[PDB]
Amino acid sequence: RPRFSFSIAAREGKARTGTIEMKRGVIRTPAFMPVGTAATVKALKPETVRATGADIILGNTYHLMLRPGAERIAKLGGLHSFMGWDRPILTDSGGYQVMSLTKQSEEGVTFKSSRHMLSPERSIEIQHLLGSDIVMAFDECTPYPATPSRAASSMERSMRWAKRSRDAFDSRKEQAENAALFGIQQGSVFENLRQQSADALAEIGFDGYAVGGLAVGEGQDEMFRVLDFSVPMLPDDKPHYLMGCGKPDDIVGAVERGIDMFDCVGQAFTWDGPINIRNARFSEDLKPLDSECHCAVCQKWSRAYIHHLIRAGEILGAMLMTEHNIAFYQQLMQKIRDSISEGRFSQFAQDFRARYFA
């Protein structure tokens, strides 16, 4: 396989389906990437993650640099070897997590976990040490709400940092030849700033483009409104990645708006909407979590059992709930991919919402 090749197989409106080929594997798009914060997808073996249908998982520059350490993971053979996942891994750059979980300057950010530094150069270096396949540019995630002046200043700094990310990536031969680099669009909810950001990123040139600065409390209506004008600003022939949860209804609407990639960190998803398994009404419910789901959890255990496990604080409860929820997300992505390929995605979206919100 090549270092990176994005191919679009079919389209419906703004929606696309296709494949990203990378050295460690093929990624089917639209894709959902389970999040593996501390070098683990919570409560799941990698083999189980793969069994649910995941093609790629996400890791985080910030969390891994704190524990166990980036240099340490490199010495031990890299993140793939360390955690036992041999398929592509996307790593976030730390731009978000430092701020949510400190001293900022044009050079970068210094923070306390134990003091640490992040810059475009150090963030790209850490992702190299981890051995990540899709490297994210180091940005500044603009708080919401932001004034136009503040959003502009932040966006401009992020674009300067996008250039530094690009050059740091390119100057490291093993990384440039084997991994890909995605830029991150900023600009808050302002169309002109999003346009300037897209223009800057396209001029620099990246393997993919993320829509950053959303899923930060603005609500689905606002997110969709911003995606409406922001995604068409991005190069059409590269993947589009919406950063952040990422609930099932968010994913459907975002795919309708041209997004190709997604992530999201007692709640069980079903085609009839989410349920909270802790609720007393499930204590003697022999049905599986969802009636149609083909995951192993729904083939074997009842709502009643999982209700008991979660209530009792049992680890198996978390294992089963997580496997089901990630498998549900993958089944959603498969239905989306199939429906786009067959030119019936707009109908699928309508059907999905009718039932999910009934």
Residues that bind Zn ion in the complex, under the rule CB under 5 A: 293, 295, 297-298, 324
Annotated binding residue 96: yes
Annotated binding residue 298: yes
CB of 307 to a second copy, least distance (A): 8
Size of interface with ligand CKR, in residues (CB under 6 A): 15
7: burial class by Cβ within 10 Å (0-12, 13-18, 19+)?
exposed
Is 213 a binding residue for ligand CKR by CB under 6 A? The answer is: yes
- The residue range among 24-32, 138-146, 282-290, 334-342 that interacts with a second copy, by the rule CB under 8 A, is 282-290
Q: Which does 27 bind (CB under 5 to 8 A by kind): Zn ion, a second copy, ligand CKR, none?
A: none
Is 216 a binding residue for ligand CKR by CB under 6 A? The answer is: yes
Side-chain-side CA neighbours of 84 within 13 Å: the count stands at 9
Is 278 a binding residue for a second copy by CB under 8 A? The answer is: no
Is 70 a binding residue for ligand CKR by CB under 6 A? The answer is: no
Q: Which does 346 bind (CB under 5 to 8 A by kind): a second copy, ligand CKR, Zn ion, none?
A: none
CA geometry: angle 347, 353, 358, nearest 5 deg: 130
Annotated binding residue 213: yes
Q: Which does 30 bind (CB under 5 to 8 A by kind): ligand CKR, a second copy, Zn ion, none?
A: none
Q: Which does 293 bind (CB under 5 to 8 A by kind): ligand CKR, Zn ion, a second copy, none?
A: Zn ion
Residues 78-117, interacting with a second copy (CB under 8 A): 82-84
Tokens of 240: 């589009």
Is 184 a binding residue for ligand CKR by CB under 6 A? The answer is: yes
Rule CB under 6 A: which residues touch ligand CKR? 92-93, 95-96, 136, 139, 141, 184, 212-213, 215-216, 243-245
Residues making up the binding site for substrate:
92-96, 139, 186, 213
Residues forming the active site:
92, 263
